[PDB]
Design a protein around this ligand. Structure first.
Ligand SMILES: Cc1cc2nc3c(=O)[nH]c(=O)nc-3n(C[C@H](O)[C@H](O)[C@H](O)COP(=O)(O)O)c2cc1C
Ligand SMILES: Cc1cc2nc3c(=O)[nH]c(=O)nc-3n(C[C@H](O)[C@H](O)[C@H](O)COP(=O)(O)O)c2cc1C
Lengths: 133, 134
């Protein structure tokens, strides 16, 4: 027997960051972020709410991933990409992003759910295996 | 304002397996599992709902993890442990589990949210790197 408050507590228990964005032409603005996201990025909610997530790329917007994200956005399809993001203080991390389009039954708008998994250690370790191999 | 439906789809979008347990006398029985959990473990919802999670350790014994889990549990405290678990087919994986007690409790029983993350590949690569550097 599960209720809504419990769903929220599941989303809050999440290690991976979790966000919800709505599409506004070429921008996709944030309408929801969980605590994990804040700890992963260093930004608080009101700092980043209602903006497009590109600010996490910082002065790095020449990634291959971006194009494929936009394509998947248009086709209303889920995708997973690895990008380089930068925290509020400027620290670098490797972000495995998953965007799942879901269509809200309330209005019939499509919202996008993002799951950010920090994979910096995987990156550095397979890189190091590459150097040792 | 984000819907209940968006909350559910957030749980369903999760990479990590996610479960909810209620305290049941002495055990913690499952009242909810997400799909990630089902494919990570190989057991379906109808097979495993409303039982205690101790079935995932398989043929193994209560290490620091089981005891300290049970302890933190009794103590209503968070814990994080890495265990060796087994799928239905008998496949082995390394499960990074995080158990968190939850309470805003309208209800009188206590819930625990468990997050099971597969970290087998990070483990094998770090084994191979450390060993190739040894
Ligand atoms: C829900 C959602 C979450 C996103 N999260 C991130 C993120 O955490 N880091 C990032 O670099 N890009 C993220 N993106 C992608 C960018 O916000 C942006 O939409 C994407 O790069 C599209 O390419 P563009 O920047 O050229 O428009 C996210 C997109 C969506 C829809
Ligand atoms: C919400 C929740 C999720 C749990 N998930 C797992 C799990 O994925 N794998 C596991 O071996 N034990 C899990 N446990 C703990 C088991 O139910 C049980 O406590 C564990 O096997 C330790 O066994 P023991 O205390 O009976 O010795 C979870 C407990 C709770 C409350």
């Amino acid at each position: 027997m599960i209720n809504a408050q419990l769903l929220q507590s599941m989303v809050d228990a999440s290690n991976d960051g979790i966000v919800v964005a709505e599409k506004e032409g070429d921008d996709t603005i944030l309408i929801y972020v969980n605590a994990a996201f804040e700890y992963l990025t260093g930004y608080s909610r009101d700092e980043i709410l209602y903006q497009d997530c590109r600010f996490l790329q910082g002065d790095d917007r020449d990634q291959l991933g971006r194009a494929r994200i936009r394509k998947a956005m248009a086709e209303g399809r889920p995708c997973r990409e690895v990008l380089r993001n930068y925290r509020k203080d400027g620290s670098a991390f490797w972000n495995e992003l998953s965007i799942t389009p879901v269509k809200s039954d309330f209005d019939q708008r499509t919202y996008f759910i993002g799951i950010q998994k920090d994979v910096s250690r995987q990156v550095e370790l397979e890189r190091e295996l590459a150097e040792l191999r």
